[PDB]
Protein: 2-aminoethanethiol dioxygenase
Amino acid sequence: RDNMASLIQRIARQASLTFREAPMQPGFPENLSKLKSLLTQLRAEDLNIAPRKATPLPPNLPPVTYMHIYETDGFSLGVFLLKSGTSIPLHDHPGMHGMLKVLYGTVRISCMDKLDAGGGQRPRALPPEQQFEPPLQPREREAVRPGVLRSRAEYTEASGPCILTPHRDNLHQIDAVEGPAAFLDILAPPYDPDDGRDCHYYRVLEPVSDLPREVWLLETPQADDFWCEGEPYPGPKVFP
Ligand SMILES: NNc1nncc2ccccc12
Ligand SMILES: NNc1nncc2ccccc12
Ligand SMILES: [Co+2]
Structure:
């Protein structure tokens, strides 16, 4: 069709409309569904990203890299590229909406939430006799929170986009399965560590089993061996 912008430009426009009057323009549910529809059409070749295959990882190379596409105050738009056998560790997205689309390879995504009384749960404190492996230091026991592990599935470019909300599937872990993988990620609002909106990491405690099952979650510092460095984005530019 004549004069159509690139798909990635149109994704960026729609995320901007989604996450920021006669006739009435779309509301949030309609805009979210349109954003989702655009992401379902996106292929790696639309970003000029050749699928990557396996090559031992030198200790100085990042396990994961990041391609910056665009960002505003409303959203961030970029690509994460995982090397073989790497993992984006379990983390949350506080108060955020998220949408991701696998471009190549296969990822295991585990989706979780911390219990929230605003949803009709009655979150309880960890019981004192409940023990774990490894055992919990006293300051760690006080910091444990209950949560629920909702799903743990493999996703490829043929899967629908994966969506999260402030209150549903807000925690996830992404493991690269059977070689390298990459996905396009939209986050809204973006992280802002200077304004106290950081990426928080977690571990699921193993005590002393189908889904969904309740679990115990402990926040933890970013792992020593996890870091994500930028690399050039080769696809169509998002203007301006
Ligand atoms: N930004 N660099 C790094 N950040 N965190 C962990 C690292 C581990 C090995 C090499 C580089 C690392
Ligand atoms: N699910 N992906 C991610 N979500 N939030 C923050 C991230 C930071 C680094 C790498 C991946 C991230
Ligand atoms: Co994430």
